[PDB]
């Protein structure tokens, strides 16, 4: 904290911090290829938690000589968020989405497992943006709703083909209750209306 203001010369610090954050993030992402499912989720969640904790510490330890004088966003938290947002465009997003979807289908098959693994990335996407959700709905939420709709159409088709409508009503109500539970205690609260509709 003393070195924060003792630095002021006193202006060429933002570029160095951005370069350090970028290189550290690239190094962290480099060791994220050998894991695709049931292992990349835990690792990604814990690395994201560590990154968020480090960003919070950095924001709380130096928040004076960033944009106080006159005026990526200068804010440390916003800078970390924008770096995470523009780094997430790498092909690892597709594999993370595939892992999350396959975990969701496995959970919906009848078994249950821990929830924080994909809850971490859900809160990451909800917090990312600056809630200003721009990339979230644009790409990942939209594709997730697409897969959800496709999967529910498949379920309806096979259930109608095989089982009678009497059990179909109960299955649909159970699925809707599960979606209500998910949108309440598993995902964000700013999507109940559109999801329902």
């Amino acid at each position: 904290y003393t070195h924060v203001y003792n630095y002021c010369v006193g202006l060429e610090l933002y570029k160095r911090l951005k370069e350090f954050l970028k290189n550290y993030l690239t190094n962290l992402l480099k060791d994220g290829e050998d894991l695709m499912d049931e292992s990349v989720l835990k690792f990604y969640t814990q690395q994201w938690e560590d990154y968020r904790f480090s960003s919070k510490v950095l924001n709380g330890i130096c928040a004076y000589l960033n944009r106080h004088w006159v005026r990526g966003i200068y804010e440390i938290y916003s800078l970390a968020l924008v770096t995470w947002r523009d780094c997430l465009f790498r092909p690892l997003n597709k594999q993370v989405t595939n892992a999350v979807l396959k975990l969701i289908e496995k959970e919906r098959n009848g078994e249950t497992i821990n929830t924080r693994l994909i809850s971490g990335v859900v809160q990451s996407y909800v917090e990312l943006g600056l809630p200003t959700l721009t990339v979230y709905k644009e790409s990942f939420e939209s594709q997730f709703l697409a897969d959800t709709e496709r999967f529910y159409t498949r379920e309806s088709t096979e259930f109608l083909q095989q089982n009678p409508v009497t059990e179909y009503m109960k299955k649909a109500e159970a699925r809707l209750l599960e979606e209500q539970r998910r949108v309440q205690v598993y995902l964000h609260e700013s999507t109940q209306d559109e999801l329902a509709r």
Partner: protein
């Protein structure tokens, strides 16, 4: 307007009737769409005393909506004047005042009027010479209590103690009005008032009793019976000791019982009252009353049967069903009510220490002879009750009355042939006959056809349409039963052929007949033809035009198509070739409108017709059918396309000379539908069969090579499902040609080459190779494993799954030549283990039991080696493989697996637990009986050896409960203490991260707590009436201040408990409210980063929603630390709504 109202007042105030009428119409129209209000109020008061009826009606109707815009100063004045006139002498003025008061209170939603009127009536209700005043006051008070009943902070005791002496009035009417008023009061009701009321009633009970006290108790209990639980234990003994009286007074005593059961379900006093009513049913001595006392006992039996569900053996093992059955020869009301009780009991017998089936079967003969004895009555109601009883007894279980058909047939015959029979009686008799014929086997209906054919045939032709439709259903069922093609039968039904045909063809004509009867006749004709038409040869080639002409009609289009489908799919040959030429275009012309059911029906009809009959087929009908395919094929609908492709699937195998014209549009639509994301299951199999038929048809421009080229064209120039579908299609195409050499080497060289070879092309080729290597042998060719390994060694992650699937499929293609190699690779290759493990999993899943039984031992010997691995995913894969392998030969693979629960280490125990957790599946499995007993040891061995092992055990329990809650129902009582042991806060590895201003606790047993809460939730939503409730409530109310996610889960569970059986939630309201109030007035530390604040709306918003859901319950008088509308929480209410 001022001038307008002045002119209206001047013109109206002229002592005129018509002018007053028009002015009243005008002011009501104005109201609908300082001094003036005084003037109009005074003039309305003057008109209130006018002798005219129409003017008084107009004024009193205007008084209603006038309260909305009138001032609030003179409302008390007009109310007081009306109350003063209420005490007048002329009865007409009394009626006018009562009408006015009722009107104003009806239009009322300023509030001083209610207080004034109740205060005045408190003195008015007191004893007076006139009895009409008392009746009017009681009616008014009833109206108040029905409509009002809000605050009443200090008015309920006064009205209470003033109305108490009125209960002993000699007039029965006054007593009834007082009872109604008291019931309305308790319904609207406070914390102690019912206590003094019940104490006074109990004190008065120990005196010269009268029907008034019992009637009042019954009324107040019916209006509000959810607040009398501690007073009953002295209420029932009083009823029992007052029942043994000679004079007829037991009516209200028995009426009390059924409402007591209806209101309060949980109470351990049932046997005494049940025995009391069982004894009271025996009284048998309008002057005579004894024919009516049993009505109350019957209602009591109805209520006790309806409310009780969990003590069926107690009811059945007693003499209660016996006494109910024998007590049948009584009056019409008694017979009807006992029949209703028995029907309700039988409806309850359906599931929601011998099983109820044994006692039901033993009592079946008794019910049968009782019903047969009851048949000998001329009353229609008894016949309908008996037929409903028979229908219920047959519907509850199949094959019930398999030894009483010969003695029950004559009763049905008499009830169908008698001239004195209602339409409902015939309808229910026919329905009972049809359901008996359907459920029971055909073997107990062959001798009775001679007796069942004449009456059914006679009943087919009736003026009514419901009776005719039911008769047609019975005829169709009898036709199906008499000639069962499933099992050979020895009986001659030649005489019945013409007898059934005459009626069936007679009802098939229009004859201005309703749609339902026509459809039933069409169905009967279709079934008769399908199962019996070889006897009908003269009318077969001429009566088929009726179906053709009826196909155009929209009213009857589905039924005729279904009948045609049933006829075509008959094992016995039916001649339809002359009709096929004129029938196919008719069905084809209907493939334009949007109707899924009709589309599927006509597709099925055409498919079965072309399958069974294909000797004569022209080209016009084929072209018409093909041209109607593009409108049927669509992405949104799958079943219609799945059924339409069957046309070409059958054509390519039966008539191979009609495939050259399938190109351009149909081919493009089929290609587009193949790559559609929604094509799974039977659609894929139909695709494979059709493509194989196309390959084997041997026609120009439809070979394997050109099809392969046209399919691979777009690939060289999408989602994963398109690749999977196209790979399956090409695999099916090349499957029909096992001697396919050039294509295999071409695919190999396509994969081996690097230049001009994308990842998608090689992935598709490898997947196709795997799919084709399922059954055909391809190991003869050399230089195959090297290229496979070279192609598999790619950096793309998406190709890994396809490579593993292809390797597994190649391995299962011929196990003996590939199993040793893959085993050696698993034992040798340390790096590429994920791919090998996935391939082994695929092999085990797809391996046949014949080809895997000798290979079980070495697979087990290798699987246990990889139990301990650094990577979690590898261990999970081995656990899944062990679980899948356990599915075959349980009696050998399960006993060994049970052995490492005590010999193996903690890691081995966790491995076997994670393996056995995957054995349980939603669908029934043959290993279920063994697991049902093995789970006991599996869960008793794992008590608390380690945190990791405990977490895996908890996950196993949650998965087992979710998959099959009924599997673990018995052992749940054993593990409930163990489940609740790890629910409290324990300090185990929580490291206090002391950095400075910011903190972040690391609780490793958050995962265990979340798992336990998940098992609690799934137990609650699966079966909640199987565990202690107080302990669960204490646990859920204690575990709040640990973490955010657990806090939301607890809030959601509390919301669920609010909307599901909230009886146990209304006790500890303060204990639940206190933590929420404590955490709401929590302000998160300011200067924290914005996500926390956003979470806090979710915590504050979630708390608001939970509080609203909790207060949705009827009990809302208590408001502990709730009335605080602070600025921060001011807008939260409306945000929740």
């Amino acid at each position: 307007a001022s001038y307008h109202i002045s002119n209206l007042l001047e013109k109206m105030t002229s002592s005129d009737k018509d002018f007053r009428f028009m002015a009243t119409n005008d002011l009501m129209t104005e109201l609908q769409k300082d001094d003036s209000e005084r003037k109009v109020v005074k003039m309305i008061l003057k008109l209130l005393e006018d002798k005219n009826g129409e003017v008084q009606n107009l004024a009193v109707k205007c008084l209603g909506p006038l309260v909305s815009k009138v001032k609030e100063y003179q409302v008390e004045t007009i109310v007081d004047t009306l109350c003063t006139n209420m005490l007048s002498d002329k009865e007409q003025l009394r009626d006018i005042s009562s009408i006015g008061l009722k009107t104003v209170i009806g239009e009322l939603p300023a509030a001083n009027v209610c207080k004034k009127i109740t205060g005045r009536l408190t003195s008015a209700i007191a004893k007076q010479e006139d009895v009409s005043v008392q009746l009017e006051a009681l009616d008014i008070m009833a109206d108040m209590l029905s409509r009002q009943g809000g605050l009443l902070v200090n008015f309920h005791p006064s009205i209470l103690t003033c109305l108490l002496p009125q209960l002993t009035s000699p007039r029965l009417a006054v007593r009834k009005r007082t009872i109604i008023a008291l019931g309305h009061l308790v319904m609207s009701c406070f914390v102690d008032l019912i206590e003094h009321l019940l104490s006074e009633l109990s004190k008065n009970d120990s005196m010269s009793t009268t029907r008034t006290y019992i009637q009042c108790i019954a009324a107040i209990s019916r209006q509000a019976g959810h607040r009398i639980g501690e007073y009953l234990e002295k209420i029932i003994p009083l009823v029992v000791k007052f029942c043994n009286v000679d004079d007829d007074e037991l009516r209200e005593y028995c009426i009390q019982a059924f409402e007591s059961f209806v209101r309060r379900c949980p109470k351990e006093v049932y046997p005494h009252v049940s025995t009391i009513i069982n004894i009271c049913l025996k009284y048998l001595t309008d002057d005579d009353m004894s024919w009516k006392v049993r009505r109350a006992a019957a209602k009591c039996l109805d209520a006790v049967v309806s409310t009780r569900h969990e003590m069926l053996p107690e009811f059945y093992k007693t003499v209660s069903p016996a006494l109910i059955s024998r007590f049948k020869e009584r009056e019409e009301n008694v017979k009807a009510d006992v029949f209703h009780a028995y029907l309700s009991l039988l409806k309850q017998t359906r599931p929601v220490g011998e099983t109820p089936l044994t006692m039901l079967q033993s009592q079946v003969p008794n019910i049968v002879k009782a019903l047969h004895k009851q048949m000998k009555e001329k009353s229609v109601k008894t016949r309908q009750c008996c037929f409903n009883m028979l229908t219920e007894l047959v519907n509850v279980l199949p094959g019930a009355l398999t030894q009483h058909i010969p003695v029950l047939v004559p009763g049905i015959i008499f009830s169908l042939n008698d001239k004195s029979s209602s339409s409902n009686l015939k309808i229910d008799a026919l329905s009972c006959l049809y359901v008996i014929l359907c459920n029971h086997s055909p073997q107990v209906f062959h001798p009775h056809v001679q007796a069942l054919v004449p009456p059914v045939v006679a009943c087919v032709g009736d003026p009514f349409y419901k009776i005719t439709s039911e008769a047609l259903l019975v005829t169709q069922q009898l036709v199906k039963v008499i000639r069962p093609l499933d099992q050979p039968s020895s009986f001659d039904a030649t005489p019945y052929i013409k007898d059934l045909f005459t009626c069936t063809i007679k009802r098939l004509k229009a004859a201005d007949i309703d749609q339902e009867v026509k459809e039933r006749a069409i169905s009967c004709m279709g079934q008769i033809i399908c199962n019996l038409g070889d006897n009908l040869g003269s009318d077969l080639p001429n009566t088929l035009q009726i179906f053709l002409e009826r196909l155009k009609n929209e009213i009857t289009r589905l039924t005729t198509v279904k009948a045609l489908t049933l006829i075509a799919g008959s094992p016995l040959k039916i001649d339809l070739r002359p009709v096929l030429g004129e029938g196919v275009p008719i069905l084809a012309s209907f493939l334009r409108k949007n109707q899924r059911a009709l589309k599927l029906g006509t597709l099925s009809a055409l498919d079965i017709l072309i399958k069974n009959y294909s000797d004569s087929l022209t080209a016009a009908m084929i072209d018409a059918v093909l041209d109607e395919l593009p409108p049927l094929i669509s992405e949104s609908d799958m079943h219609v396309s799945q059924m339409a492709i069957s046309f070409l699937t059958t054509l390519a195998k039966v008539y191979p000379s009609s495939l050259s014209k399938i190109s351009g549009s149909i081919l493009n639509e089929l290609i587009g539908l193949v790559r559609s994301p929604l094509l799974q299951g039977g659609a894929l199999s139909a695709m494979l069969d059709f493509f194989q038929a196309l390959v084997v048809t041997g026609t120009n421009n439809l070979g394997y090579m050109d099809l392969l080229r046209m399919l691979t064209g777009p690939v060289y120039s999408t989602h994963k499902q398109s690749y999977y579908s196209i790979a399956k299609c090409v695999a099916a195409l090349t499957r029909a040609c096992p001697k396919e050499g050039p294509a295999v080497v071409g695919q190999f060289i396509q994969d081996v080459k690097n230049s001009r070879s994308t990842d998608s092309i090689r992935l598709l080729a490898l997947l196709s190779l795997g799919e084709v290597g399922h059954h055909i042998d391809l190991s003869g060719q050399l230089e195959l494993k090297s290229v496979i390994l070279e192609a598999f060694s790619s950096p793309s992650e998406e190709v890994k799954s396809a490579a593993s699937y292809a390797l597994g499929s190649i391995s299962v293609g011929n196990l003996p030549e590939y199993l040793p190699f893959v085993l050696q690779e698993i034992t040798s290759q340390p790096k590429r283990q994920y791919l090998l493990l996935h391939s082994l999993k695929e092999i085990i899943s797809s391996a046949s039991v014949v080809g895997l039984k000798p290979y079980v031992e070495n697979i087990w010997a290798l699987l246990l080696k990889h139990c301990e691995c650094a990577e979690e995913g590898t261990r999970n894969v081995v656990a899944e493989c062990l679980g899948k392998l356990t599915l075959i030969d349980p009696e050998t693979l399960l006993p060994r697996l049970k052995g490492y629960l005590i010999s193996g280490s903690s890691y081995a125990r966790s491995s076997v637990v994670t393996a056995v957790k995957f054995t349980i599946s939603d669908h029934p499995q043959p290993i279920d009986p063994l697991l049902k007993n093995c789970i006991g040891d599996f869960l008793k061995t794992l008590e608390d050896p380690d945190l990791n092992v405990r977490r895996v055990a908890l996950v196993t329990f949650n998965s087992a409960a979710h998959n099959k809650p009924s599997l673990i129902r018995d052992l749940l009582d054993t593990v409930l203490p163990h489940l609740y042991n790890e629910t409290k806060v324990r300090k185990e590895l929580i490291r206090e991260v002391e950095m400075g201003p910011f903190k972040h606790t690391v609780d490793d047993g958050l995962d265990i707590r979340k798992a336990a809460f998940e098992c609690m939730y799934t137990l609650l939503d699966s079966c909640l009436d199987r565990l202690d409730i107080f302990e669960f409530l204490n646990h859920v109310e204690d575990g709040l201040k640990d973490h955010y996610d657990i806090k939301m889960l607890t809030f959601l569970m509390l919301v669920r408990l609010s909307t599901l059986c909230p009886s146990a939630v209304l006790q500890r309201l303060d204990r639940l409210v206190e933590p929420l109030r404590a955490t709401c007035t929590t302000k998160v530390k300011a200067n924290s980063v914005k996500q926390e604040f956003e979470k806090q709306d979710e915590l504050k918003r979630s708390a608001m929603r939970a509080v609203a859901a909790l207060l949705t319950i009827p009990e809302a008088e208590k408001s502990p630390l709730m009335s605080e509308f602070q600025s921060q929480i001011s807008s939260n209410p409306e945000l929740a709504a």
